[PDB]
Assembly symmetry: C3
């Protein structure tokens, strides 16, 4: 396998992902790509901008991960990287628990203390953030983000690019569409149509 990992995005998310990869203990060097930050971030060198991806980095030397919180931009850069033949390893924190029967698409990231249970399917570039849990038989579509401490009950579906906020939760058998935003603390007790922004207990359109 590649001995080097390039983490795209040196923001706060980038710092956690870089530390995630560092915790795995398998890489020989971990670096940042960032269009603005220069020098080194939290010990990790920034070697250049997102342009090194197209112009200088070899898919036979570098694994790539996209540490950008914005779902649409993460999709943008992830699809880009994949089209240039880079590997986008599913990154799972040593202190996460991921079921052996779970299927998780490339570029996804599973954070410290997060859990993905049996039969769950995660498409590409999903984020299951700090201590978030995706229970049994859930479907998380491309570039979904489950924020810290959110809990999905069994058979929860979340649509493409949707964003489930810190401390949110869902009842079992609930369905959330694409481009949805559930706020921090949202208690999702019924299906949520595409594009909507909901919050409160129970979760209702803001």
């Amino acid at each position: 396998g590649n001995r080097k990992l390039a983490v795209i995005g040196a923001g706060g998310h980038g710092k956690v992902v870089a530390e995630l990869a560092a915790a795995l203990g398998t890489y020989g060097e971990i670096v940042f790509l960032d269009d603005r930050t220069q020098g080194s971030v939290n010990g990790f060198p920034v070697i250049g901008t997102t342009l090194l991806l197209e112009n200088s980095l070899s898919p036979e030397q570098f694994d790539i991960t996209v540490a950008v919180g914005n779902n649409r931009i993460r999709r943008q850069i992830t699809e880009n990287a994949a089209a240039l033949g880079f590997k986008l390893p599913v990154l799972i924190h040593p202190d996460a628990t991921v079921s052996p029967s779970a299927i998780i698409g490339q570029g996804s990231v599973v954070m410290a203390k997060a859990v993905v249970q049996a039969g769950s399917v995660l498409k590409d570039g999903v984020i299951v953030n700090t201590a978030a849990t995706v229970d049994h038989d859930c479907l998380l579509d491309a570039f979904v983000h489950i924020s810290p401490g959110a809990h999905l009950s069994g058979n929860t579906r979340i649509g493409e690019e949707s964003r489930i906020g810190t401390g949110a939760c869902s009842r079992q058998q609930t369905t959330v569409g694409s481009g949805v935003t559930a706020g921090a603390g949202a208690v999702i007790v019924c299906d949520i149509p595409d594009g909507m922004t909901v919050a409160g207990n129970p979760a209702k359109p803001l």
Copy 2:
């Protein structure tokens, strides 16, 4: 100890429990009893129905009742107990259980779940995914604490009650038996038997 485990209930919960048991790495074979499905589920073989409870020797198989429903898990559990089966407490490797916690047979403590000092759990309790039960809590028989629910210190939950996903409780609160707390329920005062509550704070529906 027994080398084989039979998990009763091959639903979604039963899949998680079977994976929990496999994560333990201490059984030679883990199998499903299911009244419906046939063949294998998630790589685990279904070998018959709850009727094999008959064919099955308590000297060969441990038993666990992976049924979500508190009433039904109660029925099957007592059944297997009466038939003289060992119903081991199944604690996920990635769960943290206090050494001073007391946990009844048949109970299942899922991944990332925490049970703190001096907590008492009766028979057949489910503490689900990342649910936490803090110091000196009392969970009576066949309580189900759902994913990511958090009980503060000195919380009591009555027999067969069901606390929903991501619910929480203030310390020194008490929940009656047969209660249903919905997801996200913020329990800041006592709950009487049979009541179904919800919301922030938890009020009857």
Copy 3:
């Protein structure tokens, strides 16, 4: 390094703390101090009252931790202990994940399943309780208490002695003043001024 630890406070909180230190497996003896409880708790001997701290105990023999939930009294006893020359080890439960870039002040306690992400700063005597998570670049001022299952998003500030209740949460870039009490389930989606007490979804003054 000291081979004995004294746990001040023998209530529920102290039981959890002494078990935490026991789980570390590095002390040869762990004892309680309490002004009321006598004998032995959970196998841990209560060897005296807090008076032993100023009277009998040697800083060359005993580390000190202040397992008092109440922020103001924890502050009081900790400062007392530090003034007397005692070491106040940061106690991190083996099943907690604490970032290597995080900074945590003496007398702080990080419980099982708790997580503190990158660049987070914690001042003296913080408690991050069971399964509570403090994400990236959060600032927790001295003697803050994050109750079980509370999830703080990135760049959350918590002022001195404030108390975030069980299962509470914050959206990112949220600031909370000193002496605040956010109760169980409080969904903090805006700043919160000093001394205030809030709860609800969203958190409002009661």
